[PDB]
């Protein structure tokens, strides 16, 4: 509109209205020029291309993009406490995005006639990089100014080489809106229908569903021999009841398993050898081995073991100001899934035992361990929990088939997720004036809630702040102004029957 | 209801996570209901 | 930490009505103890 009139205001707040919540967040961003306005082929060979597991081919682009895909972008630590204590489920409904108050600089002075190119990809024609849990998100704390990440993508490779099937994409080929310091940009988005995320834990376990007071009318095989001696074979049968709960017939079995190596936080219990990569669970795709991370949803450990964690099984967050490489275990936050041990097998345990032979007069019954177990009819399981620091949605790959599309790192799987929003400085002339832009961004997401109907008599487990005195307030700034989040917060506190 | 603008999470009343022989605010093996502790009303905070 | 004498009634705060003394219980609303001292409680000042 004009140079001397603001194109948008500052909106950050949370409206709690009935069964819905509306979160609003505004931040300040700074957008540099990437690749000196160029597209550049990238691969592993420029880095030496030693490992075939790490081989890649693709292109870096001059464009940047916006990422709000973590929960702490949209929720304050208090609002997150209000969500997880008071509700069984939630899910996003509507999305509103606004880009305004554009300011372009020259290297420092304004360039008033410069433009900013911004488009959203609503046909999903570009590679979708938002569901990989990359850094670069809107900062959790509203006063921090953040840098817009550079957009890049990977396509098919043979070693570091490309193939004839490899697609090249120029983002200039898309129609894009151009903004000066008086223009603004906005659009709305509608989440496709997804199931509620389950922010609760079961107060029952899959094997304990029975009435403890009453026998079943079904019989099991109690004895195959009368006693010690020769030719003592017999078949004896017994009622399954409160005395023996292991042998009772059941209608539903626990979910699938792919076993993880077990690692103790007490280090002297670990074997004295380098097992990180070699002892890892992994899958193979076209000869390349990728670690299974985080993998299928499984309980992190049995009750009474907090020290063990699956090697690649759990999401591990770094604390504020944690280094990049080879940091100690006190620098990171290892999430655990203790609430799914009711319906889900333990990650570091076998699924069970199976009969491996035909017994006979000359051969004993032999059994073997099930290390991995696919889906069987009659299974029930829980998905992975979501965290304040964690991802929200992912794009379901477009394929002939999939099963239970919920993304393994957690959150809401979608065939049409919130679209990629691409942004860059329009070049002002291979010699170019050095230039960058800054502005504001506001994002508004509407969240549907599922209220808690429980008849439980005794009080629930709630997420609480600890009262005892400390040098700092948790989820606040320190004396140097740094904001930090001291611990990961899951969503599962309230309980439901199984 | 509270409209509070506090950024950091509040203090809440919560039952203990750890294992115990009995459940707090429940019956025992003999059918005796019991209240293990007094519960006041003041957890959330306001500015003065 | 308590004194070795009986002061439950004698050391009590109280009010008098028509000659009859009544313990001041629980009394006006006041903080039970200073910050950091959880082991001290007002004699008649608390509900038990």
């Amino acid at each position: 509109d004009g140079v001397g009139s603001s194109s948008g205001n500052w909106h950050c707040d949370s409206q709690w209205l009935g069964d819905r919540v509306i979160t609003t967040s505004t931040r300040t961003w700074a957008l540099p020029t990437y690749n000196n306005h160029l597209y550049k082929q990238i691969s592993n060979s420029t880095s030496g291309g030693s490992s075939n597991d790490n081989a890649y081919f693709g292109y870096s682009t001059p464009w940047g993009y916006f990422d709000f895909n973590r929960f702490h972008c949209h929720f304050s630590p208090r609002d997150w406490q209000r969500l997880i204590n008071n509700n069984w489920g939630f899910r996003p409904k509507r999305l509103n995005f606004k880009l305004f108050n554009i300011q372009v600089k020259e290297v420092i002075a304004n360039n008033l006639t410069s433009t900013v190119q911004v488009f959203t990809d609503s046909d999903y024609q570009l590679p979708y990089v938002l569901g990989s849990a990359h850094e670069g998100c809107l900062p959790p704390f509203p006063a921090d100014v953040f840098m817009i990440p550079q957009y890049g993508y990977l396509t098919l490779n043979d070693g570091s080489q490309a193939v004839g099937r490899s697609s090249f994409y120029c983002l200039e080929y898309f129609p894009s809106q151009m903004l000066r310091t008086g223009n603004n940009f906005q659009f709305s988005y509608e989440f496709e229908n997804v199931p509620f995320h389950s922010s609760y834990a079961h107060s029952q376990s899959l094997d304990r569903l029975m009435n403890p007071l009453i026998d079943q009318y079904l019989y099991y095989l109690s004895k195959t021999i009368n006693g010690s001696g020769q030719n003592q074979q017999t078949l004896k049968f017994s009622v399954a009841g409160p005395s023996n709960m292991a042998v009772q017939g059941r209608n539903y079995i626990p979910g699938p398993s792919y076993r993880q190596q077990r690692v103790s936080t007490t280090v002297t219990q670990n074997n004295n050898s380098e097992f990180a990569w070699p002892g890892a669970s992994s899958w193979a795709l076209n000869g390349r081995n990728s670690l299974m991370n985080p993998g299928p949803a499984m309980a992190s450990h049995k009750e009474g073991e907090d020290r063990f964690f699956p090697l690649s099984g759990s999401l591990i967050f770094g604390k504020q100001g944690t280094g990049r490489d080879n940091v100690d275990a006190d620098k990171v936050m290892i999430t655990n899934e203790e609430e799914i041990k009711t319906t889900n097998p333990v990650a570091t345990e076998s699924y069970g035992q199976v009969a491996t032979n035909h017994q006979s007069a000359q051969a004993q019954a032999q059994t073997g361990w099930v290390q991995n177990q696919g889906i069987l009819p009659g299974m029930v399981w829980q998905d992975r929990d979501v965290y304040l620091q964690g991802p929200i949605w992912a794009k379901i790959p477009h394929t002939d088939g999939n099963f239970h599309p919920s993304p393994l790192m957690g959150g809401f799987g979608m065939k049409h997720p919130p679209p990629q929003i691409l942004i860059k400085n329009t070049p002002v002339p291979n010699s170019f004036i050095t230039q960058y832009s800054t502005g504001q961004v506001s994002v508004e997401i509407e969240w549907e809630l599922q209220k808690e109907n429980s008849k439980r008599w005794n009080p629930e487990i709630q997420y609480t702040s600890n009262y005892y005195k400390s040098n700092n307030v948790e989820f606040a700034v320190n004396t140097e102004g740094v904001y930090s989040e001291p611990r990961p917060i899951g969503t599962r506190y309230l309980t439901r029957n199984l | 209801k509270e409209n509070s603008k506090r950024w950091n999470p509040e203090i809440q009343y919560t039952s203990n996570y750890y294992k115990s022989n009995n459940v707090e605010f429940a019956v025992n093996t003999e059918g005796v209901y019991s209240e293990p502790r007094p519960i006041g009303t003041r957890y959330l905070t306001r500015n003065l | 930490q308590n004194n070795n004498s009986e002061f439950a009634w004698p050391g009590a705060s109280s009010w008098a009505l028509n000659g009859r003394n009544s313990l001041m219980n629980p009394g006006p609303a006041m903080a039970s103890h200073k910050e950091g001292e959880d082991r001290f409680f007002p004699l008649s000042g608390s509900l038990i």
Partner: antibody
Framework: QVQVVESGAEVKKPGASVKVSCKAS????????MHWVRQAPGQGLEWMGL????????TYAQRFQGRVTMTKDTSTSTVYMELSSLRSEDTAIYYC???????????????????????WGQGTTVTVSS | QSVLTQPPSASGTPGQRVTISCSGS????????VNWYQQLPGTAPKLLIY???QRPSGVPDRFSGSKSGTSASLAISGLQSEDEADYYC???????????FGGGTKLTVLG
């Protein structure tokens, strides 16, 4: 003055049962908690059990549950500790400790009783050997 | 899975400050009061600090106690030869549902 006279040293074989008595005098026996804590010859302290001022409620360390018994005698002002099915590792010194914190504090968050024991008994050396 | 851990040894010279710390689980140090015991060789343990920072009567002012988060520390200042003893940090543990002691920290004066 307050005193906690610990019993005499003994020598026991595996499988035997040893009872250590603790005689308090100079204060009110009923009022305080009594803690039992063992210390191996070269090792740190290990808490065994607890008995409340009334004698009705007793808590044990999980390691010792079912092989330990504690009883309090108001008449002679003596607390006793029972250890059964003795093992080589059992050999230790057994301390009897008085706990002056009578009540629970119910603040915001979980409640707690302060378990600090001011008066300690001299100790008894129990050896489990053949 | 809940443990109390202290460094096995400490050292200092008379008059220097020496701090002894132990690390605890959320169930014990985090939610319960921490008490400190000092034990000289051949004698029963003596309570030094109770209820995190409180000091019992007849105990010298130089000893100090602090609790931060899930970690508890004991500070000794104006150190002397007599002070040298084994130090244990203790706390009630909810999961254990009993009292839990640290491994003990043997202090060694220099001279």
């Amino acid at each position: 003055q307050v005193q906690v006279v610990e019993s005499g040293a003994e020598v026991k074989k595996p499988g035997a049962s040893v009872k250590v008595s603790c005689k308090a005098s100079g204060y009110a026996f009923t009022t305080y908690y009594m803690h039992w804590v063992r210390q191996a010859p070269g090792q740190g302290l290990e808490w065994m059990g607890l008995i409340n001022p009334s004698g009705d409620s007793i808590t044990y360390a999980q390691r010792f549950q079912g092989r330990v018994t504690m009883t309090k005698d108001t008449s002679t002002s003596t607390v006793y500790m029972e250890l059964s099915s003795l093992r080589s590792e059992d050999t230790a010194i057994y301390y009897c400790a008085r706990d002056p914190n009578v009540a629970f504090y119910y603040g915001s968050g979980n409640y707690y009783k302060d378990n600090a024991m001011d008066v300690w008994g001299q100790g008894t050396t129990v050896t489990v050997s053949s | 899975q809940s443990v109390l851990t202290q460094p096995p040894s400490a050292s200092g010279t008379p008059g220097q400050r020496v701090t002894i710390s132990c690390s605890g689980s959320s169930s014990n140090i985090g939610s319960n009061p921490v008490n400190w015991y000092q034990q000289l060789p051949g004698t029963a343990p003596k309570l030094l600090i109770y209820s995190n920072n409180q000091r019992p009567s007849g105990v010298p002012d130089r000893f100090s106690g602090s609790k931060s988060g899930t970690s508890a520390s004991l500070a000794i200042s104006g150190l002397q030869s007599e002070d040298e003893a084994d130090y244990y940090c203790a706390a009630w543990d909810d999961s254990l549902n009993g009292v839990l002691f640290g491994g003990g920290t043997k202090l060694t004066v220099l001279g």
